RNA sequence: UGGCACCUCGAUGUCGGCUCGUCGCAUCCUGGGGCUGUAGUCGGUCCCAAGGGUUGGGCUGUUCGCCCAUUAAAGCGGCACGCGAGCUGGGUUCAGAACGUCGUGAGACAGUUCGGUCCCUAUCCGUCGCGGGCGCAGGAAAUUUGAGAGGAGCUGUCCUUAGUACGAGAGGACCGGGAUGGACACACCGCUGGUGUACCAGUUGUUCCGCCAGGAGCAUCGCUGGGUAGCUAUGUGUGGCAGGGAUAAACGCUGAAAGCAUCUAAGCGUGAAGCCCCCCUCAAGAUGAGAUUUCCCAUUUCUUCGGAAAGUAAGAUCCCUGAAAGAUGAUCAGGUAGAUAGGUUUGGAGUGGAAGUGUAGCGAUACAUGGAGCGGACAAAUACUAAUCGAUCGAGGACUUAACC
């Protein structure tokens, strides 16, 4: 449950290091995302010397919540921080390695690269 | 249960000196909700005395008042209302399962209209 | 919230129509004969159920 | 309770699970289905919780992995876990552990019994 | 068209064969027999009326008994009515059982919501609380009741009054399975009422 | 924006926001069409259409306006600029103080600036719920028809048809089929969570139970970690599916007036998210008081007939035990023809390893007996306790005509 002001730490190589929301795209009035979810937000602090750059708008892929998902079987997942990968026009990421798990609902969504990317799907 | 128009550490204390003056007294007059709420208190105390431990003799004595019934020529010690319930109350009812107390109605009080009964235990 | 009107003699018994009380519930005591309330200890021979109280 | 609950969900209930308490170290062999095939992935970590009756029992199991905690909930009677075996037996004294989310190691660490 | 009434007995969950889990709610139908037929040339329209429990002699009067006896069974705690139905079949006395449906159906539920009290108009209808702080003094009230120029408040302003116990039908909602012996019926999902309560189980309209 | 000065000065509270809506159509989106300087995709303009829908923030007291990010869309207006006996009080519009300016001055300024008391127990109508009475030509118990009324009505993206029709390319369809969402609505607590002040455990200070051990009172439930039933959303299930009849704008067939032509004059056919149905709920006080099945029957006294009272039948209640119900009435489950509530015996969730004794250690403490002990509201058995005994209400069915009679 991630709404706008939410503000979380992003999980990839790009100069970002952390996140806040602007809107959750895909409806009117929605009013959330969840994993897997793209959403349009800026950037509130940048490592020196890194591709993107601080005050920058750009949009992002949710990838692991502290309220995570249910399957369909009736098994949850929950992590412990809430994460975030900066992708570009089509779901490509800007960076080259992504740090940390991330959730398997990223690849019914068609996010491959990321996927492949990641040092764990769970 | 049912709250009696008092808070929760008032409503303990109630329930405490009304369940000590059946056993000492073995008849008591009180108004009707107050009465079958003590219902359950004193037989719940009964079937403890049933039992008839250490364990259940400390159990019980978390609850009765320390109060002395009469005293006797055994040295004249006197006896208390816990040593009444373990020692007279309790083999009284050695071949009854349950319903140790009974309900008369009376009438209602002249100052408040209260509904008054009277609860003694055969 | 203040009347606006007063309230005439005819208004006030119709609001008072149901303003009445109840008749008791009472029978007569086997025992004593004399009247008593149902489900209760009689008064006069103090008896229930045919059992001295 | 309601007894024909009971009666109905009899003949579903797993028997092949062993015997585990909230503390001990387990290992889950769950059958994960990608796009088309059919695998087992392991999840190994101390059991958190354990709560429910009867077929609508669950359990929670939390893993640090790569820097980041991860919990996992399963039902107990699910056949979608392959299997389950303990590894260890760890000593609490709690029912709960809720308190493990706030630390790291060296003081996440349970005993052993 | 099918039908039958039952008891909503509790709420539990299943494993399908696929894997995944899911919600079932279970109903037992047992001791229902058909009393009486309606037609088109006594009554106007067609109808089967059925009956529930049987319940002790002591409890039912006369009237129903009589009624009861005219098909040669004991009396029964509720009798409802099924339209759009076969009048064919039905035989007046026989019995009617749950095997009638089949694991894949989809069925109507019909009940009696459980009840709430005298119940304010947030809970009821779903308003919005004024502020709660910045020195507000409006928190969970009705509202507005109208503008000026009527003089009057209109209809279906919506007030506080006594909240549940309508009755409300929930449709298009699939069965699980059928246990004939216990004279149970596993059903996906919700039903109105509060256990115990009586739910009339019949054949989706749509 | 004004003109007038007709009601109100023995008082008709003012801007913006909040809560709650309702109406108009000069239609912002979605639906159906005509013309195009309409190749396709996208548009322009007009016609029919009010069913539903119509975002979250930065600045300003702001309405307005600009900007950021979305969206199918971010409509224009009325209702005392809708709504202060529903809320706020930032602005304006009270007494204090200061600036610029005007005045000799006291002071003033649709100039600015900081601070500044928002009262009321609802009588009548109105609105939302719930009861009592009588009526419905005998008295009762159930099941219902439906005049009439309310609710709902929204919409995106992806796949296929198809890289097909179209187009030099670039680009890229109509019509049809499927899948999955946003916002909204109803129900429910099996799952994830919330609460859970008579459930379980740890712990500080101090007083008490004569002392140790074990417990109790008070300190926000003293604090802290969990948590049953019940109530719940952020959780789960389901809905707006597919359609029928008559039409609006429009498109036609046959056809004269007016040897031709013409959709109209007589006569036929297509045609919308709109109308009436379908779907959900209320509904016979619908005084037009309806229908079906079943039960009780035709007593006794007086009456000038009309009619009255006075015991009953079927049935219902008083009173009592209660919850799946509830402000109180009402509803529902029961009253010994008994499992209605309490207890008792077995369980269950929940907490987590009781007291007593023993062993190891100088000691705090640890281990065993032992998944132990406790266990509000949850489950099943069991008349042990209380639903004892009684009392009250409740029909003998008017007349006329019409068919076997
Ligand atoms: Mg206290
Ligand atoms: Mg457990
Ligand atoms: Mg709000
Ligand atoms: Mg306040
Ligand atoms: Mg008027
Ligand atoms: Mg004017
Ligand atoms: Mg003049
Ligand atoms: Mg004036
Ligand atoms: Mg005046
Ligand atoms: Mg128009
Ligand atoms: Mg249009
Ligand atoms: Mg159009
Ligand atoms: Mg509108
Ligand atoms: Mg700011
Ligand atoms: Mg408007
Ligand atoms: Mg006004
Ligand atoms: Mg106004
Ligand atoms: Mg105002
Ligand atoms: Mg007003
Ligand atoms: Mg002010
Ligand atoms: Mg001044
Ligand atoms: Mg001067
Ligand atoms: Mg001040
Ligand atoms: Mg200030
Ligand atoms: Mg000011
Ligand atoms: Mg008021
Ligand atoms: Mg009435
Ligand atoms: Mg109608
Ligand atoms: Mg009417
Ligand atoms: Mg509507
Ligand atoms: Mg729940
Ligand atoms: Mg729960
Ligand atoms: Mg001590
Ligand atoms: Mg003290
Ligand atoms: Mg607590
Ligand atoms: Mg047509
Ligand atoms: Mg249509
Ligand atoms: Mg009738
Ligand atoms: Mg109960
Ligand atoms: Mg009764
Ligand atoms: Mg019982
Ligand atoms: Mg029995
Ligand atoms: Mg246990
Ligand atoms: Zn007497």
């Given at each position: 449950?991630?709404?706008?002001?939410?503000?979380?730490?992003?999980?990839?190589?790009?100069?970002?290091?952390?996140?806040?929301?602007?809107?959750?795209?895909?409806?009117?009035?929605?009013?959330?995302?969840?994993?897997?979810?793209?959403?349009?937000?800026?950037?509130?602090?940048?490592?020196?010397?890194?591709?993107?750059?601080?005050?920058?708008?750009?949009?992002?892929?949710?990838?692991?919540?502290?309220?995570?998902?249910?399957?369909?079987?009736?098994?949850?997942?929950?992590?412990?921080?809430?994460?975030?990968?900066?992708?570009?026009?089509?779901?490509?990421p800007r960076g080259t390695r992504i740090f940390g798990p991330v959730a398997r609902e990223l690849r019914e969504n068609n996010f491959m690269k990321i996927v492949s990317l990641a040092p764990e799907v769970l | 249960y049912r709250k009696l128009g008092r808070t929760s550490s008032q409503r303990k204390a109630l329930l405490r000196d009304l369940a000590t003056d059946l056993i000492v007294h073995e008849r008591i007059e009180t108004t009707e909700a107050r009465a079958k709420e003590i219902r359950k208190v004193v037989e719940k105390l009964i079937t403890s005395g049933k039992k008839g431990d250490l364990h259940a003799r400390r159990q019980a004595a978390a609850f009765i008042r320390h109060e002395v019934v009469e005293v006797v020529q055994v040295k004249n010690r006197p006896v208390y209302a816990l040593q009444k319930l373990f020692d007279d109350v309790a083999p009284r009812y050695a071949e009854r399962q349950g319903g140790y107390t009974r309900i008369l109605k009376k009438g209602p009080r002249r100052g408040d209209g209260a509904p008054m009964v009277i609860i003694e235990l055969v | 919230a203040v009347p606006f009107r007063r309230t005439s003699k005819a208004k006030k018994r119709k609001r008072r129509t149901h303003v009445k009380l109840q008749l008791p519930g009472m029978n007569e005591c086997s025992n004593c004969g004399e009247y008593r309330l149902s489900h209760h200890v009689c008064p006069e021979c103090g008896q229930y159920d045919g059992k001295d109280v | 309770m309601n007894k024909l609950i009971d009666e109905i969900t009899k003949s579903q209930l797993n028997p092949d699970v062993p015997s585990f308490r909230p503390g001990d170290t387990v290992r889950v062999h769950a059958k994960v289905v990608e796009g088309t095939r059919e695998r087992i992935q392991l999840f190994e970590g101390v059991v958190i919780k354990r709560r429910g009756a009867g077929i609508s029992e669950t359990f929670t199991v939390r893993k640090i992995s790569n820097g980041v905690g991860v919990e996992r909930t399963f039902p107990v009677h699910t056949p979608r876990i392959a299997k389950l075996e303990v590894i260890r037996r760890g000593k609490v004294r709690r029912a709960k552990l809720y308190y493990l989310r706030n630390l790291r190691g060296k003081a996440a660490r349970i005993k052993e019994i | 068209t099918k039908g039958i009434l039952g008891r909503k007995v509790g709420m539990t969950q299943v494993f399908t064969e696929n894997g995944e889990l899911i919600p079932v709610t279970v109903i037992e139908a047992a001791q229902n027999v058909v009393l009486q037929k309606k037609t088109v040339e006594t009554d106007g329209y067609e109808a089967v009326q059925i009956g529930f429990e049987d319940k002790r002699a002591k409890l039912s009067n006369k009237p129903e008994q009589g009624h009861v006896a005219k098909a040669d069974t004991t009396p029964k705690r509720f009798i409802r009515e099924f339209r759009d139905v076969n009048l064919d079949e039905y035989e007046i006395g026989a019995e009617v059982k749950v095997d009638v449906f089949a694991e894949g159906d989809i069925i109507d539920a019909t009940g009696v919501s459980k009840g709430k009290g005298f119940q304010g108009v947030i809970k009821r209808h779903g308003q919005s609380r004024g502020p709660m702080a910045h020195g507000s003094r409006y928190h969970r009230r009705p509202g507005s009741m109208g503008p000026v120029a009527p003089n009057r408040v209109f209809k279906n302003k919506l007030l506080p009054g006594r909240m549940g116990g309508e009755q409300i039908t929930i449709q298009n909602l699939e069965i699980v399975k059928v246990d004939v012996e216990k004279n149970v019926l596993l059903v996906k999902g919700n039903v109105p009422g509060a256990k115990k309560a009586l739910v009339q189980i019949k054949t989706a309209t749509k």
């Open positions: 449950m991630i709404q706008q002001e939410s503000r979380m730490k992003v999980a990839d190589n790009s100069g970002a290091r952390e996140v806040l929301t602007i809107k959750v795209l895909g409806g009117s009035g929605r009013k959330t995302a969840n994993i897997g979810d793209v959403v349009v937000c800026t950037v509130k602090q940048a490592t020196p010397g890194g591709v993107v750059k601080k005050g920058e708008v750009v949009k992002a892929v949710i990838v692991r919540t502290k309220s995570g998902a249910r399957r369909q079987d009736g098994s949850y997942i929950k992590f412990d921080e809430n994460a975030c990968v900066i992708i570009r026009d089509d779901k490509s | - | - | - | -």
